[PDB]
Structure formats: C-alpha cells, structure tokens
Subunit: 150 residues, 2 copies
C-alpha cells in the first residue's frame, strides 16, 4: 500500500512508475499511474512539441507502432544521482537515461524528468522532460529519411 509509505518514498514510487510503465508498455494496458487529466510536457519549448494529454500520448504510441518497431526500452537514473523530492509541492526530479532499440538502431539520450503527483502522492498529474534537442532533431531527421513501416 502506497499510503503506508512515507510521503517522500511514496512520491518516488509514483514518479518512478512512469519508467516502469514505459518499460512494460502494452497497447492493451495503456498509460497507468496517471490522473485522468495528466499532462506530458516536452522541454524546451524551442523543440516545438506541444503539451499532450493521456489520449494524445496513446495516439503517438499507436502511430509509431505502425512505422517502426520499438524493443528493449530501458530507463535508469544516472549513477550517483539521487531523486530530488519536494514533498510540499508533490514534485520529484530525476536525472535519467533512456535506451530503446528503434528500427535498425539504438535510441539513447540523457534527460531531466520532473514529476508532479496528486495531493495523495499516488498518481502522476504532470510529467515534464527536458530533452537533448540536438540529438532529438537528428533522430527526427533520420526518421523522416526512413520508409514508413521500415
């Protein structure tokens, strides 16, 4: 039971669940551990990715399913990093790396993630990720030079 956990640990578990969900992702189970109005933010705004609802994130996942296979998604905290928890603000900050096998190659970058939970600290209300814009523009470019469906 999450509510038996100390608030600090509860926030970390609930924030961490985002990466476990992505690691075990199945279209038949969808995005779990989120509030109905949870929003995903992609920083910086200069990258041009608009804020997205649970449903819009689902549509992105469904869309890329048809264009590229995704396998072996892996998320880990950068070694030596510790979760930054602001209990009063229901916020958790991780320093993260994400790995995945996309089509014929490796996706792998480094991120800042900022989670915000509901008042109870049991569901994610907002996910924000600051992204490696040079890497992501390059990935997007190679993606555009690729035949849809491989």
């Amino acid at each position: 039971d999450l509510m038996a956990l100390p608030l600090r640990e509860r926030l970390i578990q609930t924030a961490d669940h985002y990466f476990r969900n992505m690691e075990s992702f199945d279209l038949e189970t969808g995005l779990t551990g989120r509030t109905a109005d949870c929003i995903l933010k992609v920083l910086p705004a200069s990258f041009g990715m608009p804020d997205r609802t649970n449903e819009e994130c689902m549509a992105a996942h469904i869309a890329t399913r048809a264009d590229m296979t995704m396998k072996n998604f892996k998320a880990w905290r950068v070694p030596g990093s510790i979760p930054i928890v602001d209990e009063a603000n229901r916020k958790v900050v991780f320093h993260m790396e994400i790995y995945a096998e996309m089509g014929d190659g490796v996706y792998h970058n480094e991120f800042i993630f900022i989670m915000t939970t509901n008042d109870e600290g049991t569901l994610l209300k907002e996910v924000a990720e600051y992204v490696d814009t040079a890497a992501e523009k390059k990935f997007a470019a190679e993606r555009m030079a690729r035949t849809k469906g491989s």
Copy 2:
C-alpha cells in the same frame, strides 16, 4: 541574515543568488555565494562541456570579454513554475530562461538549473544546468 530564514526560503535565496550574481557580474568582484570547491556542471554529457571549478569559470568569463561584448544579462523563471526544494538534500531546481545581448545578437534560451548548497544552506556547492544543445551548438559554431 541567512540563518534567520527558514531552511526552505534560505535554500531558495542561496540558489537564486547565482542568477543575481550573473546579472551584476563584475570581474573585480567575481563569483559570489559559492563554496571554494564549487563545481559547475553542464548537462547533457553529450554536449561535451567538462565540469569546471570556480576559477575555470572565471577563466571562461575572462576569455569571452575579449571576443564579444555581453550586456543586459537577465535571468527569470519560466512563468507558472515554482522552485523545487529538497530540504533534506539541500537541493533547489529552477526552470529558467536566460537573456543577454552579445555582439549585436540576442542570446536567449531555456534551461533547467539544479543547485546544491552546503549543509548550512548559505553557499552554493554545485550548480548543474541542462542546456538547449541544438541552440548552444549553433551559437558555439557561429563564434
């Protein structure tokens, strides 16, 4: 007095000082509010900028004054954001934009800053910034 403030507010003020120091930066006063062993980290590692001591930061500040004039440095939090403070870990996280005027170009980008203070919450022990790598590489190539 800083030790008169509650820790949360003292951590924010110590973290915030970094940007006020940058805004009024003067070679003859240098980098204030930092422990002597303070380290500036520039994320992501893929950007290829190595960690720097107080003195290596001053060196870079000095080396840039000869190539281009910098004026009207302004730092502000992204509206709607709040400082994220982890009292136990002496950590503060800001969502920031930074503005400056160079050899007639505007510099302006959005960042995450992560500050770590000393145990008293009076001085900066570490500053980490996650930068906009597409834009910072452009900028660095333009020079």
